[PDB]
Amino acid sequence: KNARVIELIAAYRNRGHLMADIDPLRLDNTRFRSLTLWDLDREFQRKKLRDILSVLRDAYCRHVGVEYTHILEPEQQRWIQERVETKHDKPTVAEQKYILSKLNAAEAFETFLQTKYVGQKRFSLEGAETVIPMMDAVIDQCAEHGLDEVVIAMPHRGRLNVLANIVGKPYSQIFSEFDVKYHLGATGTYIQMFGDNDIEVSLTANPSHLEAVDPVLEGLVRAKQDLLDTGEEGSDNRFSVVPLMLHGDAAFAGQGVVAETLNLALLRGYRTGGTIHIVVNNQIGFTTAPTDSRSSEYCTDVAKMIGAPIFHVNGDDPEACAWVARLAVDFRQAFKKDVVIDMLCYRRRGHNEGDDPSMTQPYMYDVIDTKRGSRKAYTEALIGRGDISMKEAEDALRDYQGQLERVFNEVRELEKHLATAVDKAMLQRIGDAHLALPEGFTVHPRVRPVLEKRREMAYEGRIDWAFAELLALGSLIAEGKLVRLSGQDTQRGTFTQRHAVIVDRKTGEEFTPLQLLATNPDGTPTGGKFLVYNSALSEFAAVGFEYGYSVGNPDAMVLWEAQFGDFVNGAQSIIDEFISSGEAKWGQLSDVVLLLPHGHEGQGPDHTSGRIERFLQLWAEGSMTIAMPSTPANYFHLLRRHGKDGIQRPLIVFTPKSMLRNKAAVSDIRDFTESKFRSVLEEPMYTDGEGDRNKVTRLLLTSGKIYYELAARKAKENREDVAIVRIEQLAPLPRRRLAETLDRYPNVKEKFWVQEEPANQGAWPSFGLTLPEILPDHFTGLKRISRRAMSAPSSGSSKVHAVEQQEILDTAFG
Amino acid sequence: DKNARVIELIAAYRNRGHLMADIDPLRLDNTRFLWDLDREFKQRKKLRDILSVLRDAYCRHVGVEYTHILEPEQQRWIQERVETKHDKPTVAEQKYILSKLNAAEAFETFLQTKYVGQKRFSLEGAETVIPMMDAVIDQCAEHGLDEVVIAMPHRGRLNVLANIVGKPYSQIFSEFDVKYHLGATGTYIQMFGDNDIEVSLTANPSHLEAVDPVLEGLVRAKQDLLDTGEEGSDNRFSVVPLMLHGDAAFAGQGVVAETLNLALLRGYRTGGTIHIVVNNQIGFTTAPTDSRSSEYCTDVAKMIGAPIFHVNGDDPEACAWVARLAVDFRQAFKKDVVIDMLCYRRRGHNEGDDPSMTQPYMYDVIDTKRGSRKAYTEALIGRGDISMKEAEDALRDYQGQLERVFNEVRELEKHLATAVDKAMLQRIGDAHLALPEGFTVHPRVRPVLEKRREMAYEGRIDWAFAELLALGSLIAEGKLVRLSGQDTQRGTFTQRHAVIVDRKTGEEFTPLQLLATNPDGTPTGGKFLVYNSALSEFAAVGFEYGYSVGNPDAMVLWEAQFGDFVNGAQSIIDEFISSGEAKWGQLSDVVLLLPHGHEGQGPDHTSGRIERFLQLWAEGSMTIAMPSTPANYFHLLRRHGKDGIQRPLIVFTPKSMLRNKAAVSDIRDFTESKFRSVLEEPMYTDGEGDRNKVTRLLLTSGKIYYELAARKAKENREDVAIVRIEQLAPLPRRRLAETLDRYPNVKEKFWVQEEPANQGAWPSFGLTLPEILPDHFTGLKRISRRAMSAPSSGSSKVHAVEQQEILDTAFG
Ligand SMILES: CCOP(=O)(O)[C@@](O)(CCC(=O)O)[C@H]1SC(CCOP(=O)(O)OP(=O)(O)O)=C(C)N1Cc1cnc(C)nc1N
Ligand SMILES: CCOP(=O)(O)[C@@](O)(CCC(=O)O)[C@H]1SC(CCOP(=O)(O)OP(=O)(O)O)=C(C)N1Cc1cnc(C)nc1N
Ligand SMILES: [Ca+2]
Ligand SMILES: [Ca+2]
Ligand SMILES: [Mg+2]
Ligand SMILES: [Mg+2]
């Protein structure tokens, strides 16, 4: 008999959520319908069975469905049951009236929005108003913990309601020159009603693409946490900036970026100390029923991936919703992990204007038509329970009416009215740092020559690409800049060229040479920092995160590196919806850098191209900088210009692979100490050598590593009649520098754009159309030399590649 | 007290025993690991006997996760098969497992000894996946199933071809890196049984996990052909997806969650996938602590309550046993099973990798490791299962296989009308009113059904009905039609109503499904499969691509809510749809329907990015179209389904043009016409218009035609002509040249478009048209919106000014 009690306790803890009264529509008519009575007064801590069962039913089978026994941490399971399996204190009339006032503000906003403006039906929060007192309780609990800020990310349902009743934006600013308003960022201050603290509340900008903003929010919060010296890269472990992420039930279950973002939750390079998730679960996805949207019992079942606790709550019980919200903030503060709140509600109206939702969901909408709103339900529940009087309930209807009048009145009143060069001592210092090993550190035998070669390069020259990159980042850290670098295997580098972090051969202890540059020679800090990480095997969440990080800290140098440029198409929604277009659409600026290893080397269609043609197609004046440098020094100056120009604009860099080790692709010390970024490059024989530009009759215009192959061929045949000009900055086109460079070759009879990429790829589709228009006296008659148009970036054969590469070189000198 | 402590101990082993199980063959984590024993407890058994059953079941070389499963019958099924004294395998079964290890290791030695640059394809340290996969396929043949279809990354691929798919070495090493991405097909013959089963391998790009929904789609198409599964007569789901993964990719790629989310959906279920994660506890140079935020790489599978089995890759018997249990669970509950095989990567990730640079501790333990073949040969001696002579013979079975592959490869080196009759239209029209007895139509759906009967007999056929006329007529001709996308049954713009819902019961009725039956009552062989998809682009597009590969005879259409969200499926468009044919010889006839058009609804409700599909295009890879009339769309779909060519079709479809009263077609356009790649104004082909009066030619595509035609009619501009390019790719060079030759007095030609200057057809047409037709398009100018970093403005007011500005420039 005593063992059957233990199994009964576990059954309520494990599966009680399946019998909880969480659906305010009660659609499932089989949910509830599918030891002895003398054992109830027997004692089994010693408590009677009737008392054990009453605690279990109240905790697990009322308006809150708790999912927590999947959590592997026993201390976390114990923490939840200790707060859930107790007789809770009923809220004070003041707290209940405050919750009612929030529901009054929410429903008064939705009534106005629908009655005053046209085409607002799709933004309607009606049937889900309880999310306003729930979000209020989240932010108020964060202020109770003395935290610094809450950053919200959400889809567009109830967004202006959130702006007015959560962010605290006035109606004069919200409805000023009144649909882009449902995607813009906002910032405000939350002041506690019954407390003495305040907290910053901000809402991040987003596209229509549901859940795409999820990793953006995380990066943005992480950047703010790093600035406030809180969290993983902070002195305290408070993680004082809280991500509050809102979702829809269909989108939460169907979008892969949800799993990718949850996968970042505890990573040292990406953790934000736990996200508070709120799913506005109105049990519908436009016309689609949940049975066609997911293969699991709950829309939130993906969150079990990271062992997050889940609370299914009845959206018609605003007190249970406010209680769960506060418990969620307390759990996040105690364990630095994600908490998911699944708010079960309904969508009162159609999804949009042309929707009669009884066409596709006739049963759901026969039940929703008999439903009276949450505000009215809660007013009636408070009257029944004896908590408020008739006068008090009527006064709450007087508060509703007043809030409805104020928004109609306020809106009525509103309608009536730079050098990038460094000193040789800076290069030497970055070189010396690679040998300034901690006491007793063991370098791996194959890493030691790289360190010694870097000291040699810093003092003697022949600086390679990999070191030039670290010279740029190291000099920025020495000047006080925060640098964040990440990507797949970025600490070592895909091509074993970086070694930004080196690992002790015997202990596994990490050493970061560039971090020594954050301290001045006198011993004082520079204000700079080097944050280098290996990313998860993700493109979409990682690129979203880095974009978000640069928005969070405009003063940070943020670089994301693709393993190969070919895999960046996995992050196309971020490129399309945030990076390339956020500035023009929302006034949101980002200085994020994307490093894309690019080049035809015979390694196949997924190890050859970062799709230059796609970034060039996305480009429009001042949206991005797109470059393909051919020398280490020009790359060094490109990164330093980007970090010091005071302009917030993304930089797309097509980076080398075998050209990292090309002995001709090296730079002299003077190229770093007495030069600047060169958008257009001539051959050294004309600028430093004894070459004669007047002998040139054929001009080859190119970009990237093919330059070295063209230069080698010219040198082999002694072709003084051919000159090779490189376009280092692909976008914006360096019109003036290009014109001035070409004017130095007066006897040119023919001009050719030479590229490795197929004819429908690389720079030709845009340059072939743009160059003859922007410079008609220079490029009228411009012809193309490249691979044939292909449906893939290249051939699968390294043999077919080698024949095509030779064909390009032979055509250019034919 | 003592008896209740036993119940709590049993639950602890069932729930958390997997945390203490000896699953890691490297034992990296050095912190992961009596009088009541002879007393009998309640069945009556001694505590020592209860506890030994729990330790053997949950804390040996198999870590079982199943108490997260919400179905009590599934928890009970696992419990019963895991908590029993299992029969030890026969010497014949053990020697067979050893023979599979011998073949797999010899292959690896040969591959690393003979050829150069093969390091990254090495399965060394992970060879036990070969007897594990063998057990999966053998258990599927024991159930009498029809086929096992495999999807995997490139590690161990050529080993899988030779020792699983059964391909000979002469076919594998013929003209010997594209071989690590091609599809393959073979027959598996049972060693100790009398059944055989088909085994196939699907093609894939380098993008890890991108093939996951493609495999599901391919399998579902084969299941529908065999009349098995969700759309079948039997519930056997006799085509089994076997999906292999890596541990870093399984945890980090979102497409994994998206594909798992399809596992039980009526439109996407394949009756359960067998998942095998080759968990070598590393991703190139990255440790699991930088790859995931959970205890196991397989924790995502808990999303659909899938049972998970963590198995020690150095124990080939536990691996084979778990594989067979997984197939039995999939057969019993038609649900996914995940096998997490813990192993190691013996060598570097590739040529330039000394793995001890980044993982020095792991690789010092790996360097002391002897392979699972040598280990299992030794374990059989220790157990007394095999003799010295048997162990020596097994070592000479290894040597023989090693010789055979070197010798066989040595020996290798030495050597159509789309028009329908009026009766067909009338029949599809009549079907919309042929309601089942007692069916209640929603009051707003009834006029749609009555207007379709009217359109079928009287004309003025709109876009939405023209689509159903094309699909219906294909079903009547015996074709299988699969249509899906977000809210596709009704249509995003409430225009389709492919499925109608009973107002009082909620019962679904599919009017086009009546066309699957001939007037005499016999079946046509056709079928209409229409579904609402999950809120996914990547998995759904991958699935539909896979479905067309699985059934080349099927008409497969995927519909975006708005073309603006198809960029969420960019990896599928880039790696499969646009390039699969040229890269792998793999053909697909998948259709993508992308609602497109500038209407002032913002940058995410305006464009399907025409310019991107046109940039991806290369001769004969895809067909790209933007029809302006219902009849031309009807003929486009009918040509695509009847041309006998397996090529993807990209269609930019309307939104407000669905209800444009000028955008309607006559019955004769369906009964006495064909697809027209280039369209002239009806005043010149049927009316009294004079082509010789024309001095300005406006070339365009899509709905802007109607706005340009209305302006021409308003001002009576006989000097202007509007020519539409309906087929954007391949460019209809011949018909375009012939059409323009009919306007001899043209002095100026303009490409007119709604899209910004860097978007739409202009970036490609502006460069291509003057080159392919120099005598017609030299001097071709552009009329469009300015170049923009987004597909449009956020303002409907800015949109309206820009739209008017385009029309004014075209007639200025
Ligand atoms: C006409 C249908 O499309 P739409 O209404 O214009 C829209 O795009 C809305 C979002 C926006 O545009 O900002 C949305 S609303 C919606 C249903 C959402 O379901 P749920 O997640 O349960 O949220 P809800 O129940 O609260 O709605 C889809 C599929 N739409 C299109 C869509 C598709 N795919 C992606 C990735 N993002 C999208 N915005
Ligand atoms: C030089 C590193 O890149 P690469 O080796 O060329 C390659 O592309 C390989 C696959 C292929 O190209 O076919 C792979 S192998 C690999 C590590 C995989 O780890 P796991 O999932 O644990 O599997 P494993 O341990 O069995 O390897 C990555 C990140 N590479 C690049 C890559 C990135 N992102 C995506 C979506 N797909 C990829 N192929
Ligand atoms: Ca900048
Ligand atoms: Ca076809
Ligand atoms: Mg919803
Ligand atoms: Mg791995």
Curated annotation (Swiss-Prot), chain A:
<feature type="binding site">
    <location>
        <position position="250"/>
    </location>
    <ligand>
        <name>thiamine diphosphate</name>
    </ligand>
</feature>
<dbReference type="GO" id="GO:0005829">
    <property type="term" value="C:cytosol"/>
</dbReference>
<comment type="subunit">
    <text>Homodimer. Interacts with the FHA domain of unphosphorylated GarA. The 2-oxoglutarate dehydrogenase (ODH) complex contains multiple copies of three enzymatic components: 2-oxoglutarate dehydrogenase (E1), dihydrolipoamide succinyltransferase (E2) and lipoamide dehydrogenase (E3).</text>
</comment>
<feature type="binding site">
    <location>
        <position position="729"/>
    </location>
    <ligand>
        <name>acetyl-CoA</name>
    </ligand>
</feature>
<feature type="binding site">
    <location>
        <position position="607"/>
    </location>
    <ligand>
        <name>2-oxoglutarate</name>
    </ligand>
</feature>
<feature type="binding site">
    <location>
        <position position="284"/>
    </location>
    <ligand>
        <name>Mg(2+)</name>
    </ligand>
</feature>
<dbReference type="GO" id="GO:0045252">
    <property type="term" value="C:oxoglutarate dehydrogenase complex"/>
</dbReference>
<keyword id="KW-0210">Decarboxylase</keyword>
<keyword id="KW-0808">Transferase</keyword>
<feature type="binding site">
    <location>
        <position position="625"/>
    </location>
    <ligand>
        <name>acetyl-CoA</name>
    </ligand>
</feature>
<feature type="binding site">
    <location>
        <position position="249"/>
    </location>
    <ligand>
        <name>thiamine diphosphate</name>
    </ligand>
</feature>
<keyword id="KW-0021">Allosteric enzyme</keyword>
<dbReference type="GO" id="GO:0000287">
    <property type="term" value="F:magnesium ion binding"/>
</dbReference>
<keyword id="KW-0786">Thiamine pyrophosphate</keyword>
<comment type="similarity">
    <text>Belongs to the 2-oxoacid dehydrogenase family. Kgd subfamily.</text>
</comment>
<dbReference type="GO" id="GO:0008683">
    <property type="term" value="F:2-oxoglutarate decarboxylase activity"/>
</dbReference>
<keyword id="KW-0012">Acyltransferase</keyword>
<feature type="binding site">
    <location>
        <position position="282"/>
    </location>
    <ligand>
        <name>thiamine diphosphate</name>
    </ligand>
</feature>
<feature type="binding site">
    <location>
        <position position="737"/>
    </location>
    <ligand>
        <name>acetyl-CoA</name>
    </ligand>
</feature>
<keyword id="KW-0456">Lyase</keyword>
<protein>
    <recommendedName>
        <fullName>Multifunctional 2-oxoglutarate metabolism enzyme</fullName>
        <ecNumber>2.2.1.5</ecNumber>
        <ecNumber>4.1.1.71</ecNumber>
        <ecNumber>1.2.4.2</ecNumber>
        <ecNumber>2.3.1.61</ecNumber>
    </recommendedName>
</protein>
<dbReference type="GO" id="GO:0006099">
    <property type="term" value="P:tricarboxylic acid cycle"/>
</dbReference>
<comment type="pathway">
    <text>Carbohydrate metabolism; tricarboxylic acid cycle; succinyl-CoA from 2-oxoglutarate (dehydrogenase route): step 1/1.</text>
</comment>
<keyword id="KW-0560">Oxidoreductase</keyword>
<feature type="binding site">
    <location>
        <position position="679"/>
    </location>
    <ligand>
        <name>acetyl-CoA</name>
    </ligand>
</feature>
<comment type="pathway">
    <text>Carbohydrate metabolism; tricarboxylic acid cycle; succinate from 2-oxoglutarate (transferase route): step 1/2.</text>
</comment>
<feature type="binding site">
    <location>
        <position position="249"/>
    </location>
    <ligand>
        <name>Mg(2+)</name>
    </ligand>
</feature>
<feature type="binding site">
    <location>
        <position position="676"/>
    </location>
    <ligand>
        <name>acetyl-CoA</name>
    </ligand>
</feature>
<dbReference type="GO" id="GO:0004149">
    <property type="term" value="F:dihydrolipoyllysine-residue succinyltransferase activity"/>
</dbReference>
<feature type="binding site">
    <location>
        <position position="210"/>
    </location>
    <ligand>
        <name>thiamine diphosphate</name>
    </ligand>
</feature>
<feature type="binding site">
    <location>
        <position position="641"/>
    </location>
    <ligand>
        <name>acetyl-CoA</name>
    </ligand>
</feature>
<feature type="binding site">
    <location>
        <position position="282"/>
    </location>
    <ligand>
        <name>Mg(2+)</name>
    </ligand>
</feature>
<feature type="coiled-coil region">
    <location>
        <begin position="387"/>
        <end position="417"/>
    </location>
</feature>
<dbReference type="GO" id="GO:0050439">
    <property type="term" value="F:2-hydroxy-3-oxoadipate synthase activity"/>
</dbReference>
<dbReference type="GO" id="GO:0004591">
    <property type="term" value="F:oxoglutarate dehydrogenase (succinyl-transferring) activity"/>
</dbReference>
<dbReference type="GO" id="GO:0030976">
    <property type="term" value="F:thiamine pyrophosphate binding"/>
</dbReference>
<keyword id="KW-0175">Coiled coil</keyword>
<comment type="function">
    <text>Shows three enzymatic activities that share a first common step, the attack of thiamine-PP on 2-oxoglutarate (alpha-ketoglutarate, KG), leading to the formation of an enamine-thiamine-PP intermediate upon decarboxylation. Thus, displays KGD activity, catalyzing the decarboxylation from five-carbon 2-oxoglutarate to four-carbon succinate semialdehyde (SSA).</text>
</comment>
<feature type="binding site">
    <location>
        <position position="251"/>
    </location>
    <ligand>
        <name>thiamine diphosphate</name>
    </ligand>
</feature>
<keyword id="KW-0460">Magnesium</keyword>
<feature type="binding site">
    <location>
        <position position="736"/>
    </location>
    <ligand>
        <name>acetyl-CoA</name>
    </ligand>
</feature>
<feature type="binding site">
    <location>
        <position position="208"/>
    </location>
    <ligand>
        <name>2-oxoglutarate</name>
    </ligand>
</feature>
